[PDB]
C-alpha cells in the first residue's frame, strides 16, 4: 500500500560572540566603533609597500592626521587605529598582513577581537572595552556575519578568501465483479518544516509543508475499522517577507501558503481485512462531509525586541478526484489512493504582526493544524473490484462433512409383516419350489 | 454501510504474459520569472511538467505515445550577488541531484496495452539516459551577461509504477518510470 | 510471508470412533511392548477448515497443520473386556 551576508555599509549593533567579516575593495577605513566613553576603534586598509607619510582618513566624522606604512612588498596590511578617550590621540595596534583582503572584528567577553599576523597563518588580538555588548559597528563596505562557534570558518577565509512475442502463465479461472460500500472516517493532519538562517538569528529561510501521516481507528456500523492517512499538499505558493538588508532586519526567505487554484492531495495505506483486501479495482468513489483548516500562531523568537507572530489563514476543503496508484517493484506491487481537495479561502485572513503584512488570504505553513491533533471528514466510499473469491463450485468431490445417518427396521417389526404376508402362499407352487436345491447364489439373487 | 452485491454473473481469466520492446521519449520544460524593478533580479527559475506526444514503430505496429514528464524532490539554490539594486541576484533556482525523481507518465494506443488491465507482475529491462544543461544567459541593464551553463544527471528505472486517473466518468491510464538519479559531468 | 498479510489456515474437524480390535507391538532400540492398539473411524465434524487470503474454504476433515489446536492432549476413556484362556 504505497556565512550570512553580503550585508551592505551600515551601522548596526551586532550581537556579541559572532565575527563581522569585512570585504573591502578600496584602501582607507573599513570599520569603526566606539562606546562613546572608554574606547574608539577603526580598522584602516593600507596598500602593500608604503613607506611612512601621513595620511587623512575620517574617523567617526572626522578628518585625522595618520602616520602609516606597510613594510610588505605585496601584502596589504590592516591596522587597527584606536583611542582611549574622547580627545585622545589615536595609536596603532595589529597588525593583519593580508593577500585575501578580508578582515573581521567580533564583540567578545568584555572586548573587541580583531584578526592579526600574516596570512595564511593568522591568530587574533582583543582591545578591552566597556559596555562591550552595546558597541555599534560602522561598516563601510560589505560584509557577512558568522557565530563564534564557527570560528574556524571565519579563519579559513581570512587565511585563504571566500525481440518480440508473447506466451502464458496460469491457466483458465473463475472470476467474479463486485461493488463494497463502507463508511469512513477520515482523518488526517499536516506537517512543517520551519528552518532559520544561521548567522545573527533574524533571519528565517523556509517555512514549508511536508507529508505528515496519521493512524486511527472508528466504528462504522459494528465494524471497528483501522485507518491511515497521509496527507500532502500540492500547486503551493512560495512567499516572501522582506524586513531589509541589514542583520538586524527581520526576514523569512520563503514561506508556503495554500490557496483556491490549489489542491490538498492526502497519499493512503491501512489495516481492516477489508483495505487489506483492495485489490483489482475497477472503481472508486467517495461520498464525503466538508471541512474548514485553519491556521494557528506561530512566534518568531528575535534575539532583541518584540515577537513577530504569524497568525491566521483559511481554506475549506472541497472533494476532487480519486485516483489509484500501483508501485511495480521487482516482482510485487504496492497500492494506494491519492485523494484531491480543492480549496476555497476562508476566514479569517493571515498577517504576521509587528509588520505591513497582513490580510492576506490562504493558510500558511507556518501551524496549519492549529493545535488540532486531525482534521476531519467522514462519510461512505463505494469499490467495485473483481477477484476470484466469488468461486466454491470448482470445490471436491463427496465435500460431506458427515456420512448420512439411516435408522433401520427393528426386529420385533418386520416380523408382523412377514406372518400376514404368509397367509396368501400358494400351495403347489411352494412345495415344488422345495425340490429346487435353492443354494447360496439362489437366495442372493433378488433383494 | 458494509455490503458485498452482484453485478455480474462469473466470467472467464486465463492470465497471459506479453513479452515486448518500448521507446520513452520525454522532456523537461522551465519556468524563469524575472523580479520587477531595475533588472538585476531573478526571483525563479523551476521546473515545470512538460507533455510530449510521438510515434515509433515495434515489430510491423505503429504506436503512438504520450508522455508527460515532472519532478519532485528538487533543491532549491540561490545566487546572491548583493544587496544592491544593480547586483546580480536569482532568488531561487531549482536543481535536480541525487535525492530527486523524475518522473513520466506514459501512454500509448497498441492493442497490448489495452490489454494491461488485471495486472499480476511487470518486469522491464530499461536504459539509462543522460541529461545535459543547456546555457542560459542572464542579459542585465548594464554589464556582460552571467551564464548558467552545464549540469548532468543519469536517469536510472526506479521501477514503474502504474497511475489510474478517474474524473467524472472514465479512467486514463499511464505509467510513471520514476528514475532516480546520479549526477554526472559536466558540473554547472 | 516475507511481504504483507499472512494466510491463515483454521478450521476443520473429525470426531473418532472406535473400530475394531487386534493385536500389535513395539519395538524400540531395545525391549517390546505388546499391546491391542485399536483403530479410531472417523466421521467428520464442524467446523469446515478453510485457508484465509485465499481460495480454500468449506472443506471438511482434519488438516494436518495444528491438529492439536493448543490441547496438551485428546482423550478418549471407557473400558475394555477380554476373555481369556
Given at each position: 500500500w504505497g556565512l550570512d551576508g553580503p550585508y551592505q555599509p551600515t551601522t548596526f549593533n551586532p550581537p556579541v560572540d559572532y565575527w563581522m567579516l569585512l570585504a573591502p575593495t578600496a584602501a582607507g577605513v573599513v570599520v569603526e566603533g566606539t562606546n562613546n566613553t572608554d574606547r574608539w576603534l577603526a580598522t584602516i586598509l593600507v596598500e602593500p609597500n608604503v613607506t611612512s607619510e601621513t595620511r587623512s582618513y575620517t574617523l567617526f566624522g572626522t578628518q585625522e592626521q595618520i602616520t602609516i606604512a606597510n613594510a610588505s612588498q605585496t601584502q596589504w596590511k590592516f591596522i587597527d587605529v584606536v583611542?582611549?578617550?574622547?580627545?585622545?590621540?589615536?595609536?596603532?595596534?595589529?597588525?593583519?598582513?593580508?593577500?585575501?583582503?578580508?578582515?573581521?572584528?567580533?564583540?567578545?567577553?568584555?572586548?573587541?577581537?580583531?584578526?592579526?599576523?600574516?596570512?595564511?597563518?593568522?591568530?587574533?588580538?582583543?582591545?578591552?572595552?566597556?559596555?562591550?555588548?552595546?558597541?555599534?559597528?560602522?561598516?563601510?563596505c560589505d560584509f557577512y556575519i558568522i557565530p563564534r562557534e564557527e570560528e574556524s570558518t571565519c579563519t579559513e577565509y581570512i587565511n585563504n578568501g571566500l525481440a518480440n512475442e508473447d506466451i502464458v502463465v496460469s491457466k483458465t479461472s473463475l472470476w467474479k465483479e463486485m461493488q463494497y460500500n463502507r463508511d469512513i472516517t477520515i482523518r488526517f493532519k499536516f506537517a512543517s518544516s520551519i528552518v532559520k538562517s544561521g548567522g545573527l538569528g533574524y533571519k528565517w529561510s523556509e517555512i514549508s509543508f511536508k507529508p505528515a501521516n496519521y493512524q486511527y481507528t472508528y466504528t462504522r456500523d459494528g465494524e471497528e475499522v483501522?485507518?491511515?492517512?497521509?496527507?500532502?499538499?500540492?500547486?503551493?505558493?512560495?512567499?516572501?517577507?522582506?524586513?531589509?538588508?541589514?542583520?538586524?532586519?527581520?526576514?523569512?526567505?520563503?514561506?508556503?501558503?495554500?490557496?483556491?487554484?490549489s489542491y490538498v492531495y492526502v497519499d493512503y495505506w491501512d489495516d481492516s481485512q477489508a483495505f487489506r483486501n483492495?485489490?483489482?479495482?475497477?472503481?472508486?468513489?467517495?461520498n464525503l462531509n466538508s471541512v474548514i483548516c485553519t491556521g494557528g500562531d506561530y512566534s518568531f523568537a528575535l534575539p532583541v525586541g518584540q515577537w513577530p507572530v504569524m497568525t491566521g489563514g483559511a481554506v475549506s476543503l472541497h472533494s476532487?478526484?480519486?485516483?489509484?496508484?500501483?508501485?511495480?517493484?521487482?516482482?510485487?506491487?504496492?497500492?494506494?489512493?491519492?485523494?484531491?481537495?480543492?480549496?476555497?479561502?476562508?476566514?479569517?485572513?493571515?498577517?504576521?504582526?509587528?509588520?505591513?503584512?497582513?490580510r492576506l488570504y490562504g493558510l500558511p505553513a507556518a501551524n496549519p493544524n492549529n493545535g488540532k491533533e486531525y482534521y476531519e471528514v467522514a462519510g461512505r466510499f463505494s469499490l467495485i473490484s473483481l477477484v476470484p473469491s466469488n468461486d466454491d463450485y470448482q470445490t471436491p468431490i463427496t465435500n460431506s462433512v458427515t456420512v448420512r445417518?439411516?435408522?433401520?427396521?427393528?426386529?420385533?417389526?418386520?416380523?408382523?409383516?412377514?406372518?400376514?404376508?404368509?397367509q396368501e402362499i400358494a400351495m403347489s407352487q411352494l412345495i415344488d419350489l422345495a425340490l429346487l436345491p435353492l443354494d447360496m447364489f439362489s437366495m442372493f439373487s433378488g433383494i
Open positions: 583611542k582611549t578617550t574622547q580627545n585622545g590621540s589615536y595609536s596603532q595596534y595589529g597588525p593583519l598582513q593580508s593577500t585575501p583582503k578580508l578582515y573581521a572584528v567580533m564583540k567578545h567577553n568584555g572586548k573587541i577581537y580583531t584578526y592579526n599576523g600574516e596570512t595564511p597563518n593568522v591568530t587574533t588580538k582583543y582591545y578591552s572595552t566597556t559596555n562591550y555588548d552595546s558597541v555599534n559597528m560602522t561598516a563601510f483501522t485507518a491511515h492517512t497521509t496527507c500532502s499538499v500540492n500547486g503551493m505558493n512560495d512567499f516572501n517577507f522582506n524586513g531589509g538588508s541589514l542583520p538586524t532586519d527581520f526576514v523569512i526567505s520563503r514561506y508556503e501558503v495554500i490557496k483556491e487554484n483492495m485489490v483489482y479495482v475497477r472503481s472508486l468513489a467517495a476532487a478526484g480519486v485516483t489509484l496508484s500501483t508501485q511495480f517493484t521487482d516482482f510485487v506491487s504496492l497500492n494506494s489512493l491519492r485523494f484531491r481537495f480543492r480549496l476555497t479561502v476562508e476566514e479569517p485572513s493571515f498577517s504576521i504582526t509587528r509588520t505591513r503584512v497582513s445417518q439411516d435408522l433401520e427396521r427393528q426386529l420385533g417389526e418386520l416380523r408382523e409383516e412377514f406372518n400376514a404376508l404368509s
